[PDB]
Amino acid sequence: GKFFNTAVSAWMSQEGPNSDIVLSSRIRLARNIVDFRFPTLFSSEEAKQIVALFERAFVHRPYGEAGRFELLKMSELQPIEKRVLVEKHLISPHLAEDSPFGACLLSENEEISIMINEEDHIRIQCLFPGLQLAEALEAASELDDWIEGHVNYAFDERLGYLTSCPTNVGTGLRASVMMHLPALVLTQQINRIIPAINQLGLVVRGTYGEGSEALGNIFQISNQITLGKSEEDIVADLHTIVEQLIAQERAARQALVKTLGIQLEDKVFRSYGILANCRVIDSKEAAQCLSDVRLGIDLGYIKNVSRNILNELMILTQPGFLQQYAGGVLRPEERDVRRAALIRERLRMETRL
Amino acid sequence: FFNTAVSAWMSQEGPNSDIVLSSRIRLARNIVDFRFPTLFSSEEAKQIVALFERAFRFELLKMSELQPIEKRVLVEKHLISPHLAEDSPFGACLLSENEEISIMINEEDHIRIQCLFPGLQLAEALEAASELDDWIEGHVNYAFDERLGYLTSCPTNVGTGLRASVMMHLPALVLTQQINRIIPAINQLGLVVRGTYGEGSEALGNIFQISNQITLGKSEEDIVADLHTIVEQLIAQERAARQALVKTLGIQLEDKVFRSYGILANCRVIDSKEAAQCLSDVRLGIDLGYIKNVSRNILNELMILTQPGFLQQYAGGVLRPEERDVRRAALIRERLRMETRL
Structure with a gap:
């Protein structure tokens, strides 16, 4: 299987800006489709109809330089294939474990992963190497309008994209960066930085481990606010704090070299x-x-x-x-x-x- | 003599050399007509070195001509004793080209003959040391008492003046914590155990030296034969503990x-x-x-x-x-x- 052979795609193996500290940037956009019940309430026949809708409109469809879209149906995958897609960051644990009729529309270059029948009918994901939040938002916004030509999003003028997920209300946008911060962990600055970051409206979690663990000192920084702020403003504020973290980690590395x-x-x-x-x-x-x-x-x-x-x-x-x-x-x-x-x-x- | 850590002779593979690093025989004697090293004058020390220089391929290293770092290196290679390097300003050492044989002069006693062999070769080392002992006895007269044996100042040499020693690597008996049981058993049998490296009771690198405690009243062959038998028991126990570690871990x-x-x-x-x-x-x-x-x-x-x-x-x-x-x-x-x- 093409998508199951490699840990990191050729696309994601490119060197991006600040790639020494920032592993990757991600934009995720959640939407639900009109005239289908939310995933919290729908039937398996509704779930199948949504998959059939996306297959009709998009399977094998070209997306320019990103190649054609392939549709991977959870109903056709072995559990081990699903787990590999999770470990590559292409699908979520919810899709692999809790969506029997879930699916993922994957661009041939593995830059784009559209989850189907997760916590919302649609989760559009765009992944870029290094720190490229503006580029990933532009790509996700263009893809979002392109999908909206074939499916009708449930949208409210005041509340934004309709969803059952409290953390998605409004824009449906989650922006995040994966960062390797060994020097801030070793100098024990993380337990100071995390409460400060929360005040600025951002969330921090460890990519690996359980609970508060961040195995490998790899952390994910994302937005908390999704309603009442523009997508561009959400991403610009994350980018600002990320660049501050890059400088604090670089400063901590040079201090360690001098001290140790x-x-x-x-x-x-x-x-x-x-x-x-x-x-x-x-x-x-x-x-x-x-x-x-x-x-x-x-x-x-x-x-x-x-x-x-x-x-x-x-x-x-x-x-x-x-x-x-x-x-x-x-x-x-x-x-x-x-x-x-x-x-x-x-x-x-x-x-x- | 100062270039390598182990000579070509000592780098050869010997019997049971997986466990036994080396075997050593030391013979201590004093010479008639000279006061013991604890009391002699520096002029007497020089005369003893001069006596041996005339008697003697063997290279003669004089402590008075060596820098302190050169003496330390000889100690670390086991060729001379710490006492010679630090306490004998006019000591000397006759060193064979292959570093198998070392005759220390003006240490604790006027003459200390050392033979060092790789692996477990106690009988071979005793024979080489005895041949050199007889040869030296053809050129000097040893201080000897019919009841007390070779006259010496060190109580641990009284009688035969023989110290026989084996250096062993015992990582499995250390890891399974058998050492503090075996040492009391070995002491009872007439032998002493010390760590080669470290200070006090520690034995860095799990390297131990086993040697005779008895020097007076037992023959030289019986001293060596008894040591060899207990070393062979230690070899078998270490090898069995290694095999047991492999099966368990x-x-x-x-x-x-x-x-x-x-x-x-x-x-x-x-x-x-x-x-x-x-x-x-x-x-x-x-x-x-x-x-x-x-x-x-x-x-x-x-x-x-x-x-x-x-x-x-x-x-x-x-x-x-x-x-x-x-x-x-x-x-x-x-x-x-x-x-x-x-």
Whole structure:
């Protein structure tokens, strides 16, 4: 399967602005279709009719340089295929786990993922590498008007796009950035920054882990406000705070180099040595060591290792990709052995080059 | 004599050399017509060195001609004792070209004959030491009492003047915490156990020296035979504990030794205690066949090369405490790269 082969698409592997700290930018637009009940209330026959509506209008349809759209029906996917789409960030856990007649319209280049029958009938997602919030909003807005030519959105003049989701009321817009902030975590500035960010109207969560955890020091920053503010203003305010976070993380990295010197070089190389040689490693230690190694690459200590090892190995070591790597279902202890072996082989391949 | 950490002779593979790093025989004697080293004058010390210089391929190293760093390196290679390096201003050492034989002059006693063999070769070392003992006896007259044996000042040498010793790597008995049980059992049997590295009770790198406590009243052959039998029991117990660790831990043990390799191959700062523990782990991984591309001699060589004297030689000058951990790490990294490139 084309979409299931790779952890990160060619599109997302491009270098974008500030790609050392900002992994990616995302615009999501939620809408519901007139004359169908909300997903909270509709029947499976209604869900099927929505999928059939989108198939009629868009399957195999060209979208210019993005290629044609492919329709992936949740009713036709194995659970492991669904899990891989989640780990690639192409579909949500809600779509994979809770939408039996869900679907995803995927552009051939994997820039565009339109979820069908999630918490709203439609969730338009546009993904860009690095910090490209303006470009992703323009792409999502153009796609939004293009879809609206074939489907009729439920829209109210005062309340905006109708939805059952309190966090989508109004614009239906969620803008977010994925950021690697190892220096702010190590200097313990995060527990100060998060409450400050909430005051400015933004939300922070960890991409990986459980609860308040942010394994690999990878964080997602998004807007909280969706009603009473223009989409452009929502995105411009996020962009401002993100650029402030980039400068604080860069400042913290230079402070660590000055304060720790050879001790920091020792820390990132020890993590490299563990990843390159261990035979058993759990998810928490692997993510931490991968974060350390990326920091070492960014700062220039670690040479001859592509920085994309963080992006790619964080995804490839998730349970679905790990089962695919191993060729079959894995028990708990085999998982830690397979995880170490996958990382070892990748780092060995980096040395050969 | 100052260039390598282990000679070509001592780098050869010996019997049971997976566990036994080396075997040593020391014979202490004093010469008639000279006062004991605890009381003699510097002019007497010079006359003893001159006597041996005439009697003697063996190269003669005079302590009065060596810089302090040169003496320290000889101690770290095990060729001379700390007492010779630090307390014998007119001591000397006759060193064989292959560094198997070392005759120390004006240490605790006028003459100390040392024979060092790789692996477990106590009888071979005793024969070589006895041949040299007889030969020296043809040129001097030993102070000897019919009841007390060779006259000495050190109580631990009274009688035969024989110290027999074996240096062993016992990581599995340490990891399973058998050591504090075996040591009382060995003491009861007439032997003493000390850690080669560290201060006090610690044995850095899990390297232990087992030696005789009894010197008076037992024959030299019986002393060595008894030591050899208990070493062989220790060898069997260590080998069985290694096999048991493999059955119990499997991939978790492979993980432990490769993580220590990963640290040593890449770290930039490492202290003496962590370096010794990781080096012991890597040697265990080599012995068990998990680590297949690194010579097992790295434990022997790197424990010596990372001692303060060799480390200063490696660096080119005196080292502050924090610079020592950086140089130690760099030295290990470079040695391990040497193994990897091959």
